[PDB]
Amino acid sequence: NQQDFRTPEFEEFNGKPDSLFFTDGQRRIDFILVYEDESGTNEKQKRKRQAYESNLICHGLQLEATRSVSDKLVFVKVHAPWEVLCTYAEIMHIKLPLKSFFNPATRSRIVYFILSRVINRLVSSGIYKAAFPLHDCRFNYESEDISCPSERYLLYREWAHPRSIYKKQPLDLIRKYYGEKIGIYFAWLGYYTQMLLLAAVVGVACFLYGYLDQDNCTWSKEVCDPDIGGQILMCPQCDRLCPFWRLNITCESSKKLCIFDSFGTLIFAVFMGVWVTLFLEFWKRRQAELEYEWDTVELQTCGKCIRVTLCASAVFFWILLIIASVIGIIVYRLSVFIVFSTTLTPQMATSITASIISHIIIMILNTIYEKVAIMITNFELPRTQTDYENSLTMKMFLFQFVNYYSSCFYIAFFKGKFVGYPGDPVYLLGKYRSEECDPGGCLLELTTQLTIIMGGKAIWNNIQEVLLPWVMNLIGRYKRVKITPRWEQDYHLQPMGKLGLFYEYLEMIIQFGFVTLFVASFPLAPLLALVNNILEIRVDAWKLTTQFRRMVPEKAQDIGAWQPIMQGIAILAVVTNAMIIAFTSDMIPRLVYYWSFSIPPYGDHTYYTMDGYINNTLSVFNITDFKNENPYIGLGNYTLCRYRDFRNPPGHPQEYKHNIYYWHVIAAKLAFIIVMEHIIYSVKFFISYAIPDVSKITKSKIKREKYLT
Amino acid sequence: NQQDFRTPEFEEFNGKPDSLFFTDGQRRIDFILVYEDESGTNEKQKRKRQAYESNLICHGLQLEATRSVSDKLVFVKVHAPWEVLCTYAEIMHIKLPLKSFFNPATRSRIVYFILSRVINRLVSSGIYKAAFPLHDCRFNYESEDISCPSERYLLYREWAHPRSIYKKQPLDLIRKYYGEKIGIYFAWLGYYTQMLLLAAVVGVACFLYGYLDQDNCTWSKEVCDPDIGGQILMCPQCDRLCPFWRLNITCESSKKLCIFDSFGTLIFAVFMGVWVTLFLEFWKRRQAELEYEWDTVELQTCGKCIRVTLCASAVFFWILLIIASVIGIIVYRLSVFIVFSTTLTPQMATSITASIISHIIIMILNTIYEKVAIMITNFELPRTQTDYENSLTMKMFLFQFVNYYSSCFYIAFFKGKFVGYPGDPVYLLGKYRSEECDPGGCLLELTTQLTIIMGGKAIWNNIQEVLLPWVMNLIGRYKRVKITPRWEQDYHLQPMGKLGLFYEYLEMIIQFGFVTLFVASFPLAPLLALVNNILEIRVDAWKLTTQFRRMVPEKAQDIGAWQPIMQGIAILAVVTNAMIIAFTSDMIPRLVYYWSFSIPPYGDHTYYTMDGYINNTLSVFNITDFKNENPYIGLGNYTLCRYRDFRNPPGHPQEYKHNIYYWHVIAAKLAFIIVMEHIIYSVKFFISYAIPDVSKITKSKIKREKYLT
Ligand SMILES: [Ca+2]
Ligand SMILES: [Ca+2]
Ligand SMILES: [Ca+2]
Ligand SMILES: [Ca+2]
Ligand SMILES: [Ca+2]
Ligand SMILES: [Ca+2]
């Protein structure tokens, strides 16, 4: 309980480069503690470190220290004798196999438990420079020792190296080497990849059906027609800066719509609801199977309400701030301002530099959000580590959810919806002319945004994720910080800090939200997600195996707080897809025209048809602007312009007002929303109620194991 | 293992009327087995009974039999010695209080467990006439024995007698005497009564707000106006049998609407969604509290799929049959036919007799449904008793759900909705003129039906429930089947058969469905339910204590399969209330007229107002009927009649077609449905997520008990 003595066997030796044992070689190394003490504060640090070491030795752990070959750095090897391992395996209910005994992962876990009981506070408060377990050997080179298995080498060769991208991951080996948390994360990623493969095959089928039926979409042919669509003049989208544009300029865009706005996309949206339900249920079954196999199950007021309300209010305030930041696209404006202030076509180079600066600002904002969430959680800390982790997960996920989906939601649901008509357009404030929809359409803009986020941004994210730890290691290597032992080699690696796997989970949860919430836009989201995940498994494995210092293995029977998050995203996905199809997409007006507006009562066609849809939906507008300016007159000599709305034509008794067509279309949209939501929710409830939570084989295996034990 | 010997101490004695002990008096009676054997089948029955008795005695139970004072009836008293009780309390993990030992309830439970291990099959197959525990004494008279506590007498005096209706139930005493199932049922009933009191106070507040604001509802004043509402002629509701009726005849009805169709009802519907959420959550908390207090927690393929599909198809077929039976009101028609074939104003007597016959047919149909559900479950029996009970519960609940709510759903959502217009009315088949809405309105009809079901039918149900066991006992008493001992007295009581508490739960679940699903009609449903439950607690207690033979105590940590049923009813209630308000109620058209149809664009009023609503919603109709008959001409000389729809007036370019008003109203209804459903579901999710499942005090109490033990 006192600093009776220092670490015994204080001697230096690094002759063996791949030695995981002590100088004698009988007992292996289960932990390494790195500190520098040779050079008022220094004496206090020395005293505290000596006291901690003496207390640790008093518990039975064997510690011995060696100075670094390259001085003022001291590495203390920590090993647990057999009696200590047995007593703390009796204390901590570890399911050993009963018909070298403990694999190094569980040995390191036990030693870390011992360090925690009497380490994190010391490391944080400059007492210890580092504290970490040891890898077997270099990932690319076999271990010199023959007795010691180089399972890190095999893990790199068959699972982490890109040459083995097609091989299924050795999840048992991953769980054995890194622990249950990493293993369950990678198992979930693989299962997600398989389900994405299924959804991607179905989505490609629907996309191909839409693609083959391309020349037979009448409205696009009318749009591209120089007569039907070439003689339609559209009102300007802004004051004295947008010109009267004919519809022909959207012709190419219209073609893309016939591939992304068709009944195939609706069928695929229904199938995607079903697929999300199946994904959740079969993940529950697989999670139960993993719980059985890996034995992951183990056992170890007014003021509070006011604090909770205050923290929730602060979270809501910062969420609003992030909403304003993203919708206000202030990052791009700031990047442009910085580029202009600071100083092979110049346009593309300037765009690339602006994008790079925007990405840097984005990552800085992300770490700012992390800091804010940490501060808020500390402000309302319940001091329970699991509860603290869940609360921080929820806060950070909300921040990232807003930061990533605010632009998409604005494009889908709030961009161009409230614009009025060219006469008396809506002005929110002194700021004028709330932006209207793009000439191609809001659905096409949303599809383009999703393609950019899922196609290029995912690749750039993977490249940055694979290069950042490598660069951080390379700068240390060039910093000069000849043969090097194992502990020093692992010391010069980037330590995966707290909530390291949290970001890996968060990236995939954001991808899942992109795939499910906005699947009504384009059916190729599952395919892009599939490609990204196939790359992501290997990039995460490679960066964890090589570039990152080994973490203490943990245990977890589930992905954690992400399960309710995914369930909530699944619930929200039905509503979001229904809204996108009804509001963002133009399929409902086309269907209504085909079934109600082309018949004799409201048309001149004897049977249902789609021709004339373009000419019979664009409301006319004579140039009579309210003087509450009238920018149209100065632009050109045009007299009548047609806009995308269902107002009454000029000269009507109630002109520029919603007619029967508008309310019929609105009723159709709302009825579609209600029908789709109710049908999809009923199907999801039936599927969840008709699927066992645990696997059929797992029940029998558990029963047999209980019978035999 | 063989019939070595018969029951020892075979002797007769009934001198002590309230003796729960044997003839000696040292050991009490824990069970009574009643049989008759003194008079080829008889010898086999005798041999089997003797073998069973010998096997039972071999296990250590002490049995002795006495012949009835009034012959051929033999009662065998069964008692368990101390060693047997100890060994089977070690076998069955009973939480005894460790700082006469076993109360008679648990003694009877243990003895019944012993009987089952080596009784139900014997009783079913005529081997034993009966097998039951014993009450302490007569409910109205103190036990003669002083040592024996007459807790049945106290239970009747303070909880079951109607004189103690206002006193809170002694739930601990109920659990001690009857067991955990009965105790938890009564605790749930009491908690339901309290929550109903809260909801009823709020509903009475809303009803009073609607009642005070009665003279200021303009549309009812217009309806009752001899000028505005007296000059409106309505089209007949049927062919050549309904006359042209002026609106004045509905004036009184309109007044009632101003009390049941107002913003107060909407506010109360929102509050009722919130109240259902709070009810479920606080019941979860109370259930956890009871689990702690009473220690209720204890421990003891293609062909199958084809069988499941076949059984589900049969269930669906019978559900459709019950739908047709109830909507077809065949019970009332059959009762009228029977009355006419068989044979102080005659009208009221005939109506009362028809109602009595209808009630008899209803109870016969209920037992038929029970038999059908039993047969289906036996057809697909998984042979697990808990699973069998849950499946039978689901089947019987579905049958009763249909049988009780089909009429209400038809009135609310399918009666008068699809009628077309007087020109070319819709004919489903050769059967003509699908019935239109009542002149008062579908909402008033639904409110009247709910009042009849909740107000009078509940009282009649309570009267029948309290009289049926009493009559069945009285007929046995008059059958002559002088002093009588305890076992004979309890023998002459109606045995509460299998799933006896199932019906008690089912009645309250049906009442809960009536309260929640259709609360948008009238806000007084919680008050009527509160009165009915206040009576129901006492009637159930009285009929269980006095008129029914005592049941073996059981254990259950929850109400059972009824919890998911109530959760599903709660989920469906939001949708049903939204549909009722939007579709069944006329509030949405009134709101639209006040905000959109009374302004200058569609009205002549400078500001928002409700006057002129009646004259500006009833579509006109000139007498021009299709000849696909034209019954209107022969009825009278009227030329133009006004009907409740939004078709175009005659002479319009597209006359008798839905106009902009109809689609505006439909869009308003659907938007209200979407908004209300989403808001209510979000609020329910937030409330469930912000309420701990277990009580705050219960957590600390469990922690303290674990610390001290
Ligand atoms: Ca990545
Ligand atoms: Ca990653
Ligand atoms: Ca399931
Ligand atoms: Ca009753
Ligand atoms: Ca009852
Ligand atoms: Ca809760």
Swiss-Prot record, chains A, B:
GO terms for molecular function: calcium-activated cation channel activity; identical protein binding; intracellularly calcium-gated chloride channel activity; metal ion binding; phospholipid scramblase activity; protein homodimerization activity; voltage-gated monoatomic ion channel activity. Predominant expression seen in epithelial tissues. Also found in skeletal system where it is primarily expressed in osteoblasts. Changing residue 362 to K/E: Induces a constitutive phospholipid scramblase activity. It catalyses: a 1,2-diacyl-sn-glycero-3-phospho-L-serine(in) = a 1,2-diacyl-sn-glycero-3-phospho-L-serine(out); a beta-D-galactosyl-(1<->1')-N-acylsphing-4-enine(out) = a beta-D-galactosyl-(1<->1')-N-acylsphing-4-enine(in); a 1,2-diacyl-sn-glycero-3-phosphocholine(in) = a 1,2-diacyl-sn-glycero-3-phosphocholine(out). Changing residue 400 to K: Moderately decreased sensitivity to activation by calcium. Changing residue 256 to A: No effect on lipid scramblase activity. Changing residue 453 to A: Increased speed of phospholipid scrambling. Constitutive scramblase activity at basal cytosolic calcium levels. Exhibits synergistic gating by Ca(2+) and voltage. Inhibited by some non-specific cation channel blockers such as: ruthenium red, 2-aminoethyl diphenylborinate (2APB), gadolinium and cadmium ions. Changing residue 540 to R: Expected to disrupt calcium binding. Loss of scramblase activity. Disruption phenotype: Mice are viable and fertile, and display no major morphological defects. They exhibit deficiencies in Ca(2+)-dependent phospholipid scramblase activity in platelets and defects in blood coagulation. They also show reduced skeleton size and skeletal deformities. Residues 1-187, 373-393, 464-501, 544-560 are cytoplasmic. The chain crosses the membrane at residues 188-208, 263-283, 312-332, 352-372, 394-414, 444-463, 502-522, 523-543, 561-581, 672-692. Pfam families: Anoct_dimer (PF16178), Anoctamin (PF04547). Homodimer. This is Anoctamin-6. It comes from Mus musculus (Mouse).
